[PDB]
Amino acid sequence: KAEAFLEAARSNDTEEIRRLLSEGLDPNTRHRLGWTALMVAAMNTQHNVVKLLLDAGADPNLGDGFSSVYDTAREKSLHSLEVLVSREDEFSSRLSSRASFRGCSALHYAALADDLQTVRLLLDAGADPSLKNDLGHTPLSYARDGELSAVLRDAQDTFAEAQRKREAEERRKFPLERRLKEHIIGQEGAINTVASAIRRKENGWYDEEHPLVFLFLGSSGIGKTELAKQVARYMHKDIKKGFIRMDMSEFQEKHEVAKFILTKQLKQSPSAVVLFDEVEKAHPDVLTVMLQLFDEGTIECKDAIFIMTSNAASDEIAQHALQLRQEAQEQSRRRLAENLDDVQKSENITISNTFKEQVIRPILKAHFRRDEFLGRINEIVYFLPFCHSELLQLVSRELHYWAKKAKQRHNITLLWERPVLELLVKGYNLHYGARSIKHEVERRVVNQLAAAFEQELLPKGCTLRLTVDRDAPVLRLELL
Numbered sequence: 182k183a184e185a186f187l188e189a190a191r192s193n194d195t196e197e198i199r200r201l202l203s204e205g206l207d208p209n210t211r212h213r214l215g216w217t218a219l220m221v222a223a224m225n226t227q228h229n230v231v232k233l234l235l236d237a238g239a240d241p242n243l244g245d246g247f248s249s250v251y252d253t254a255r256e257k258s259l260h261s262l263e264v265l266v267s268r269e270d271e272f273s274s275r276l277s278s279r280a281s282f283r284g285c286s287a288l289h290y291a292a293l294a295d296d297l298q299t300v301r302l303l304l305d306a307g308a309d310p311s312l313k314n315d316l317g318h319t320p321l322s323y324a325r326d327g328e329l330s331a332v333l334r335d336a337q338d339t340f341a342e343a344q345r346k347r348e349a350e351e352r353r354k355f356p357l358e359r360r361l362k363e364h365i366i367g368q369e370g371a372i373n374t375v376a377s378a379i380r381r382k383e384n385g386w387y388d389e390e391h392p393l394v395f396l397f398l399g400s401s402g403i404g405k406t407e408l409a410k411q412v413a414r415y416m417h418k419d420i421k422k423g424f425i426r427m428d429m430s431e432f433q434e435k436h437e438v439a440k441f442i443l444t445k446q447l448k449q450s451p452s453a454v455v456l457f458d459e460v461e462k463a464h465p466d467v468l469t470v471m472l473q474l475f476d477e478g479t480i481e482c483k484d485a486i487f488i489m490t491s492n493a494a495s496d497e498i499a500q501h502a503l504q505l506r507q508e509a510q511e512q513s514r515r516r517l518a519e520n521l522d523d524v525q526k527s528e529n530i531t532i533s534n535t536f537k538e539q540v541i542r543p544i545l546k547a548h549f550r551r552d553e554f555l556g557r558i559n560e561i562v563y564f565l566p567f568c569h570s571e572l573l574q575l576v577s578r579e580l581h582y583w584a585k586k587a588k589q590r591h592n593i594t595l596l597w598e599r600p601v602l603e604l605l606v607k608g609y610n611l612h613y614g615a616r617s618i619k620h621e622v623e624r625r626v627v628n629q630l631a632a633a634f635e636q637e638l639l640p641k642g643c644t645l646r647l648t649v650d651r652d653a654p655v656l657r658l659e660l661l
């Protein structure tokens with residue numbers, strides 16, 4: 182077939198390369214053993230076709246399908262001799278590693294062939310000098326210490342500076358989101374959804390008929406209300422001012438509706454951020470008034486934000502939280518981009534959209550009795566149980582708080598390593614949520630600090646270490 186395409190790529194039969202290019206054949210094309218044509222071309226320093234391929238639009242940053250002679254021989258189930266003569270004659274005869282070549286970009290092989298020209302060609306085509314192969318080796322790793330290495334490392338510094346400027350203006354362009362991300366542990370997707378919705382309304386791409394309306398689905402004690410207040414303080418800049426919370430359970434009867442119709446709280450601020458808790462179990466009339474608020478635009482307020490919460494669909498969301506995290510982090514990845522493509526994949530119906538219209542809305546609808554009611558919401562937000570790292574970070578937040586307080590009041594330095602956190606994480610019970618952590622730290626640590634300070638065993642200016650001795654587990658405080 183087009184084996185001759187990369188035999189040409191391997192021998193630099195340029196007139197044939199153009200030919201097949203004209204027939205629309207893809208440059209990314211690989212061998213039966215897995216190397217891209219650009220790889221063979223780069224390895225044998227056949228620049229005319231390297232140049233042409235980087236012209237055609239061949240991807241430089243494509244990893245090799247080939248691993249080792251032994252390995253590929255075991256995978257594709259062949260004699261080691263077949264595989265060997267193949268890799269040797271159809272690719273290169275200078276490579277010595279019995280290690281795996283899986284994930285080597287053309288830049289890798291370029292450094293391995295020790296030629297500056299194809300390195301330069303690959304770099305000019307925006308190849309990654311930091312792309313790691315399965316081992317973790319950059320092409321710089323495999324570079325002889327030439328000025329080739331200087332070229333490649335300066336490339337590294339360039340790509341680095343690019344990353345850094347990119348960070349700087351993800352900060353400049355999405356400040357609310359930076360604020361949420363730096364004041365809230367975990368819950369990536371939630372922040373993304375909420376912030377994006379907010380500036381979606383600010384820029385004017387919602388029907389500015391009625392203020393923002395959110396529904397926070399998920400579990401107790403994982404950031405819902407916290408996120409809400411955070412948003413509030415970002416908008417009104419007064420921590421106190423912009424925020425309203427209604428405990429819905431209080432309302433379950435028709436007399437509660439007379440009370441509900443808040444009117445004064447709204448009067449203090451039209452523009453504030455309002456939250457309802459466990460909204461699923463509250464009077465339908467209360468919601469209809471709530472929906473009337475959510476449609477009307479008296480009900481004076483306009484530029485307000487409306488948030489609702491439920492433990493409803495909690496179990497369902499929980500049952501599978503992986504594809505939600507994946508999707509969330511994918512969105513963050515696609516956000517720091519700047520071309521019409523990236524936006525076009527913003528067109529796509531993301532798995533979350535399928536997730537609302539398959540499993541969630543039916544349950545949401547049945548509990549709610551109104552098609553209209555699911556219609557009224559600007560956005561539905563999901564909240565996830567913390568992964569390990571996030572729990573660690575919560576504990577960390579706690580210890581940092583107490584260390585800080587100690588250092589100002591009594592000038593005491595509180596210290597610890599990772600094990601302490603790893604142990605206190607084992608004190609996280611779900612039913613209370615992040616506070617659970619609050620408890621543990623205040624129990625296993627602050628009790629001890631208070632006890633010691635009472636007894637005058639903490640002298641002003643001392644230094645302490647939180648340690649774990651297994652003798653079953655006990656946490657011990659010591660003075661250094």
Ligand SMILES: Nc1ncnc2c1ncn2[C@@H]1O[C@H](COP(=O)(O)OP(=O)(O)NP(=O)(O)O)[C@@H](O)[C@H]1O
Nearest residue numbers: 365366367368400401402403404405406407615616
């Ligand atoms: N991601 C989080 N980041 C930081 N603090 C959190 C986080 N999640 C919960 N907390 C802490 O928990 C406290 C409030 O709990 P919170 O998560 O806001 O309640 P909730 O999830 O909305 N459910 P509920 O208990 O009904 O209000 C805050 O003071 C936080 O310090």
